[PDB]
Design a protein around this nucleic acid. Structure first.
Ligand SMILES: O=c1ccn([C@@H]2O[C@H](COP(=O)(O)O)[C@@H](OP(=O)(O)O)[C@H]2O)c(=O)[nH]1
Ligand SMILES: O=c1ccn([C@@H]2O[C@H](COP(=O)(O)O)[C@@H](OP(=O)(O)O)[C@H]2O)c(=O)[nH]1
Ligand SMILES: [Ca+2]
Length: 358
RNA sequence: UUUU
């Protein structure tokens, strides 16, 4: 059996999606070490009201003050599993809640949401059921790995630029000022752990959050969070249209899931400077394509995701942390399944399994 | 997460 992905098959009413609640958080430091606190959280600090406009040099510091995370290290769900293990007897939802949930990274769910419209990059998701709970962990495809290794110099610099933008927009303390004189270390990360539910599928997932805005209408997370992004400066209605049809879909999916209400974009010129900023409220993104014949639809995204979770749940019958049902998908085809045991696909570590078993 |  397989699962189809065409939008037409999921054009029904918007499904139930529980307002996300933050269960906790964790941080990864400069050395990629886990800390069960919010030390890595930064604060939204845009340009001063009276000062000149933005003119952030996103290339400054590249590559001398750049400390990139080692992409060869496949952490999978390890950090999230540590959080779950250290909070297993403090989870809300009542007894047996975790056993009926699906645990994964927000980014994995984002890829599910965009599947009906994605035409360039496919994916693979490893699934294992353990003590009722369904765990989903992405597997880098052979092709994605090859593309990563063949990454052009230009792309490598563009990747730095995205992280550098965050440095110009965030401060270490509330109401503080940004300090671009530092180094860009991508090992550092602040992750929010959230609870939600899509249809009849309870969810426990985590995702990196860029910063907390002290000026946010609602100060309670995740409503107080802000997502930062950079994108090429646009001048023609045609360019904006393409942006609404492809980029906003991804921005929407990513922030809608964790309940992050605003995405702030820095538009960069060909020289690598951000000379303008624009705030995109997550709940207003769809408005840009609501009457677009070539637009995307949140209901299609969510209904497909719900269908995938149902498909995964019914497919993974065996409760075994050493067993993996691999769900593979490439544009133009359905989601297919293959079964595997232990290495290399098995992803639940012994330190997690043994503790949960005992 | 970053990004084309
Ligand atoms: O974007 C897509 C495109 C196709 N499919 C599916 O791939 C199978 C063959 O379709 P086709 O390439 O048109 O010959 C069909 O499902 P099937 O194996 O017959 O249930 C299509 O629905 C899909 O799920 N998403
Ligand atoms: O629901 C929970 C479960 C555990 N803990 C705690 O998390 C730490 C790691 O426990 P563990 O890996 O599961 O053996 C221990 O405290 P510690 O930091 O070693 O004093 C547990 O008591 C906790 O606060 N809530
Ligand atoms: Ca971001």
């Amino acid at each position: 059996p397989s699962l189809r992905t065409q939008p037409s098959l999921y054009s029904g009413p918007f499904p139930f999606y529980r307002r996300p609640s933050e269960l906790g958080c964790f941080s990864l430091d400069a050395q990629r070490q886990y800390h069960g606190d919010a030390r890595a959280l930064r604060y939204y600090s845009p340009p001063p009201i009276n000062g000149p406009g933005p003119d952030f040099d996103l290339r400054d510091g590249y590559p001398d003050r750049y400390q990139p995370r080692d992409e060869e290290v496949q952490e999978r769900l390890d950090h999230l599993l540590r959080w779950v293990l250290e909070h297993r007897n403090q989870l809300e939802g009542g007894p047996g809640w975790l056993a009926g949930a699906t645990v994964t990274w927000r980014g994995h769910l984002t890829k599910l949401l965009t599947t009906p419209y994605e035409r360039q990059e496919g994916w693979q998701l490893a699934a294992s059921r353990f003590q009722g709970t369904l765990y989903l962990s992405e597997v880098e495809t052979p092709a994605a790995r090859a593309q990563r290794l063949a990454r052009p110099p230009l792309l490598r610099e563009l990747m730095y630029m995205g992280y550098k933008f965050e440095q110009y927009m965030c401060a270490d303390k509330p109401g503080g000022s940004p300090d671009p004189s530092g180094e860009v270390n991508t090992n550092v990360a602040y992750c929010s752990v959230l609870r939600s539910r899509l249809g009849n599928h309870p969810l426990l997932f985590s995702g990196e959050v860029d910063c907390l805005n002290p000026q946010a209408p609602c100060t309670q997370p995740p409503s107080c969070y802000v997502e930062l992004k950079t994108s090429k400066e646009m001048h023609s209605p045609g360019q904006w249209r393409s942006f609404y049809r492809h980029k906003l879909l991804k921005w929407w999916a990513q922030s809608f899931l964790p309940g992050v209400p605003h995405v702030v974009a820095g538009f960069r010129n060909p020289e690598g400077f951000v000379c303008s900023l624009k705030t995109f409220p997550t709940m207003e993104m769809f408005e840009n394509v609501r009457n677009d014949r070539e637009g995307w639809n949140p209901s299609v995204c969510m209904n497909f995701c719900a269908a995938f979770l149902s498909f995964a749940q019914s497919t993974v019958v065996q409760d075994d942390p050493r067993l993996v049902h691999l769900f593979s998908w490439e544009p133009g085809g359905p989601v297919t399944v293959s079964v595997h045991r232990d290495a290399p696909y098995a992803f639940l570590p012994s330190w997690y399994v043994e503790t949960m078993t005992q």
